[PDB]
Amino acid sequence: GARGGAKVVIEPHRHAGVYIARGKEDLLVTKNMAPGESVYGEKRISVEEPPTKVEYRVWNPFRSKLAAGIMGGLDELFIAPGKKVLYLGAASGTSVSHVSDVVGPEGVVYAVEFSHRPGRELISMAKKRPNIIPIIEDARHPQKYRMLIGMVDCVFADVAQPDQARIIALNSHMFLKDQGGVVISIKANCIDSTVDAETVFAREVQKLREERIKPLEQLTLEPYERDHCIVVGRYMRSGLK
Amino acid sequence: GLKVPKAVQKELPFKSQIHQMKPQKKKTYMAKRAVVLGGDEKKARSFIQKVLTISKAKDSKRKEQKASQRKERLKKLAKMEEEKSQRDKEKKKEYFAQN
Amino acid sequence: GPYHIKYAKNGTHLLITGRKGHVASMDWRKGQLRAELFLNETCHSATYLQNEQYFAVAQKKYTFIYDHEGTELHRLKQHIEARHLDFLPYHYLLVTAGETGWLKYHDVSTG
Amino acid sequence: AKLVHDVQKKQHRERSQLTSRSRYGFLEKHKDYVKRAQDFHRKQSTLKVLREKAKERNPDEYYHAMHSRKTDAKGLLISSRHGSLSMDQVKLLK
Amino acid sequence: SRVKKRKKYQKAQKKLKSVRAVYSGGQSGVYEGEKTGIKKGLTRSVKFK
Amino acid sequence: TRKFGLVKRTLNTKKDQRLKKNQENTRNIPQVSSALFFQYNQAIKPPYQVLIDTNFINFSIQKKVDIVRGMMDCLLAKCNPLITDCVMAELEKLGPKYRIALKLARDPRIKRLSCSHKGTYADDCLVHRVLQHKCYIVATNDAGLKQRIRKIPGIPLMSVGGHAYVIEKLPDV
Amino acid sequence: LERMFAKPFVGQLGYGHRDGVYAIAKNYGSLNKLATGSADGVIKYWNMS
Amino acid sequence: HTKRMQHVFQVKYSMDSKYIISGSDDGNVRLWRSKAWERSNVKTTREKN
Amino acid sequence: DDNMRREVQRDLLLIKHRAALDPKRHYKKQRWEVPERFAIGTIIEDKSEFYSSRMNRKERKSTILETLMGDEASNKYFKRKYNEIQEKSTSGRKAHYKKMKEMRKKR
Amino acid sequence: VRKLKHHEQKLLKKVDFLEWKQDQGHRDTQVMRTYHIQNREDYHKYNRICGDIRRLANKLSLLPPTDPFRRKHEQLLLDKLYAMGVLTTKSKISDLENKVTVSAICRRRLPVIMHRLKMAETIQDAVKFIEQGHVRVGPNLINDPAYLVTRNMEDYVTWVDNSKIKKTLLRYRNQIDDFDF
RNA sequence: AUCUGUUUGGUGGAACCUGAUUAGAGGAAACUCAAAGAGUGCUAUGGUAU
Ligand SMILES: [Zn+2]
């Protein structure tokens, strides 16, 4: 479909920092912060502007859950140019690097990861992207890395642990700005495999309310993934009513 | 097409005067000047008139498809409304028999 | 002519009403004309309401309230043949008297 | 379809024009007549609207566009094909 | 009966794709973009009231 | 050259912004839940999570049907009853006459759900929850609420009738 | 203004006791701590904050 | 008062004199403001005056 | 730029009507009015995808229309479809009318 | 005034500097604007006339129904108002209160009638031609744009003979004859 | 080609019908003059005043 020499009409998406490449097939793309290279072997699009050569990175929904959220039609993403974002569970630059593209040079992305092996590729990516601050630490103890993180406008949680409601909450209290963004991706099997996927999603939503995070929206990620839903919420300390 | 008699056409109000554009016979100078790109453009322009002819016909048939199913559904739908209407009458007899 | 003059309570604006009907509201110090009506009628006197934004003019038979730019806002049908006007600032009342020998108090805020 | 044989709902085929009259053309059926009648009535209705508008015209109507628009000697309105070149412009074109 | 219920079910799977997206195994070959295109101004998402 | 057709300037009610009436002046199509196969809720499996309505508690006491046990009889499965804050508020608001209905509704076996909306109208709170997760049973005997729930597809509806509970749209029974 | 701003109720402590409350005691040294009892025989220690 | 409060059997004062804790037999322990029109936030000097 | 190069103008016109390009595709329904800010870009393939998703240099062109016309399967398809449409549009028009008025003449 | 905060608004509920109850919804301004009335008290001088009609109609109402005097005068009142063109129908007596309005009088002004007779594009443009001395009613030129035209005299409303407007009309259709002018 | 006449694009916008609006609808300029709305920045610091 999108072969090497094929050329596309690139036009902006509804969300700031996201672009659509048209053609015989449509591709979600974000502008490359570090032109001339691919972090995980995605396709890249070059446009000649007056002439400098800018480069766009293809966002594959099947590899990045957030991308699958766009394509299904999330109404509100708190990620946008010039916003500080905290990414929990950054396995590697498959999805953080795309998030760094959206925020742009002005914004920053705090990628948090625990396991050392995938981290090593996170750090090597981070050198190419100045606006990414990789934090190789456990998300279950935010106190350990409090020196490194300021207020963050949005907190994105891709962490695959059974007790997500605690990690997202604890980092939300310390670092999320009031009225700030929260985006959580929930995998039904990981939290509790004994009960159906719908029950788990209802359970996680209730935990967020108890933690003062008014949830705005839930989307299921099919066909891109099975038993996944992305819940978008706002952190309302004043009152969730 | 419809041809209005000229007598009627002459005495028409200003709001409704039919614009009948006569053909031109004397060759206009611009018509004798304009350069029409030949060769590679010609094959690349006939194709555009090829594609748009398919596209309108595709839409004009799928649009006619909808109008075919629209007629069938509303006929089906009016039948349920009739049942919903006639059976509603009976309840208000059954209810107000008590009252 | 003749011209009846009333200043604002703060001295920032001047309201002049020619007898034959030239009403002008202006900032006399900086020389900016806020509004200028040429009512083809007899105007008897005028006053500034709570601030320079609004003013009232006593025309041939009725009083009219105007905006800063000269748009009329209300026609006070009740006040007939008003000859003199005054505005109580703290109470937000407009007072009138004239040939009828009736003293009418009108509240600008509630109308 | 309740209490009806499939034999009852049998297609009745449609006849054709006689060979002796084949020159004249296709034999008009009811369906093709209805198209002829509907189109004629649609056109006559517009003429009846245009005639009454002609009869009810007020000769004193004035529209600012009466200066720009022009009328032919017959009286039928003249519309420009595409909506005179100055000497300087023609010099550049030549 | 068995052959009919076999055919009824497979038809139902075809309609279910029209009603909603259904997982179909994921990724086959290089990612060739969105097959049928993406709509910028539409959100298929369920809003918390 | 004074213009022709001059007219006195006046306030225009229709177009003037300062007036309050003139001052005031991404389509969404919700996805059909993945848990739903036409009218069949495939996701729902035992044990069942169930939302209780205020009328359900009152009638249950009339018929001498214990909540936890009487339910386990109807579905032949473990049921995890859930009472929302709205339902709890309505019970308390009823008055001293219904103090027993309050005491049973506080039985520790009955878990409670927090809520995040100002009003205490429980009918709308339940209807929102069922629309958004197709993972709850609705236990209510109110005529109005039942009709709303029936329109929602894939939502089992439970009621107290006769001497014991009845479940309507729960195929696994 | 005093009447429109008179909003005395702030909230309730947790989910309450199973039975009626009949004994309330304060930690006269700590500002935000409160101990309650009920006819159920239950006693609870609260964090009012 | 409140429709949900049924027999006040215990009432006390927070040690800062700002809040009222009451216990009824419906089983809830409520908090109230000592002065309804007041608010707990730190007031600017222009508010205070 | 306001020039709106005919190559770019035709380029966008093939994306407005991309439903009719290939009879097996059948995208979603959308309007896609021309945006006020857009650019034209060329894809870059990964070196690991040399055999899978790489066009030969000769096949690459400056315009999409050139790439589309270059194919012979698509080119043959339109000629069949368009010829079918012309028959439908030309049926019963002035041409057919003259024949019916011609046969009425003895020869 | 700045947009009032909430606490202010509760304490200042009736305050409105731009709309008052005596204004009666600015029906005066609305009806001057639609039909382009220039003299301010034209609306109210009409408003007294409609009040006179309505008052008379009520007093006729309270009289007994079969009363021959009630028969005659209400027929007379409708026939006169219908002839003046204030009333479009003479069938119902109830129209005397429901369908007698200032706008019913304003629609018979010369600027409005020319607009209905298509002699102008808009009421504003109809007025300008009156003040320019293009419009005649009978052989009398009229510069007053408040001239009320009875139903009968709507027929003699016409351009002035030498008017440049008639020259454009006749020139547009190529029907200009300079002998007449 | 005093051949043929459908299609694509441009030009023009009769009648009927539908919707909105109406002292007709627009346009351009600015170190211009006004009346409002939203957002943002600024130690924005007397819990009781050297
Ligand atoms: Zn609730």
PDB file of C-alpha atoms in Angstrom, chain G residues 13-49:
ATOM      1  CA  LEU G  13     -17.545  10.927  58.068  1.00  0.00           C
ATOM      2  CA  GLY G  14     -17.074   7.822  55.959  1.00  0.00           C
ATOM      3  CA  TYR G  15     -20.114   5.581  55.646  1.00  0.00           C
ATOM      4  CA  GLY G  16     -21.360   5.877  59.221  1.00  0.00           C
ATOM      5  CA  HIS G  17     -22.056   3.257  61.854  1.00  0.00           C
ATOM      6  CA  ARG G  18     -24.267   0.228  61.377  1.00  0.00           C
ATOM      7  CA  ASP G  19     -26.515   1.296  64.270  1.00  0.00           C
ATOM      8  CA  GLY G  20     -27.319   4.657  65.783  1.00  0.00           C
ATOM      9  CA  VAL G  21     -24.479   6.743  67.176  1.00  0.00           C
ATOM     10  CA  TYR G  22     -24.633   7.340  70.933  1.00  0.00           C
ATOM     11  CA  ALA G  23     -21.083   8.287  71.989  1.00  0.00           C
ATOM     12  CA  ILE G  24     -18.637  10.772  70.471  1.00  0.00           C
ATOM     13  CA  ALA G  25     -15.245  11.598  71.966  1.00  0.00           C
ATOM     14  CA  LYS G  26     -12.476  13.967  70.881  1.00  0.00           C
ATOM     15  CA  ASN G  27      -8.720  13.779  71.172  1.00  0.00           C
ATOM     16  CA  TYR G  28      -8.402  17.112  72.967  1.00  0.00           C
ATOM     17  CA  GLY G  29      -4.719  17.282  71.962  1.00  0.00           C
ATOM     18  CA  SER G  30      -5.006  16.533  68.232  1.00  0.00           C
ATOM     19  CA  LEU G  31      -7.223  18.664  66.057  1.00  0.00           C
ATOM     20  CA  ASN G  32      -8.375  16.259  63.320  1.00  0.00           C
ATOM     21  CA  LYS G  33      -9.044  12.999  65.212  1.00  0.00           C
ATOM     22  CA  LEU G  34     -12.423  11.723  66.388  1.00  0.00           C
ATOM     23  CA  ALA G  35     -13.700   8.507  67.975  1.00  0.00           C
ATOM     24  CA  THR G  36     -17.308   7.332  67.707  1.00  0.00           C
ATOM     25  CA  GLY G  37     -19.432   4.470  68.950  1.00  0.00           C
ATOM     26  CA  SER G  38     -22.804   2.936  68.243  1.00  0.00           C
ATOM     27  CA  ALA G  39     -25.453   0.705  69.760  1.00  0.00           C
ATOM     28  CA  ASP G  40     -24.014  -2.030  67.524  1.00  0.00           C
ATOM     29  CA  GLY G  41     -21.091  -2.302  69.926  1.00  0.00           C
ATOM     30  CA  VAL G  42     -18.786  -0.956  67.206  1.00  0.00           C
ATOM     31  CA  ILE G  43     -16.269   1.796  67.905  1.00  0.00           C
ATOM     32  CA  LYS G  44     -14.349   3.596  65.171  1.00  0.00           C
ATOM     33  CA  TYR G  45     -11.433   6.016  65.066  1.00  0.00           C
ATOM     34  CA  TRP G  46     -11.721   8.655  62.361  1.00  0.00           C
ATOM     35  CA  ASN G  47      -9.349  10.832  60.373  1.00  0.00           C
ATOM     36  CA  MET G  48     -11.653  13.789  59.813  1.00  0.00           C
ATOM     37  CA  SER G  49      -9.234  15.375  57.328  1.00  0.00           C
TER      38      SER G  49
END
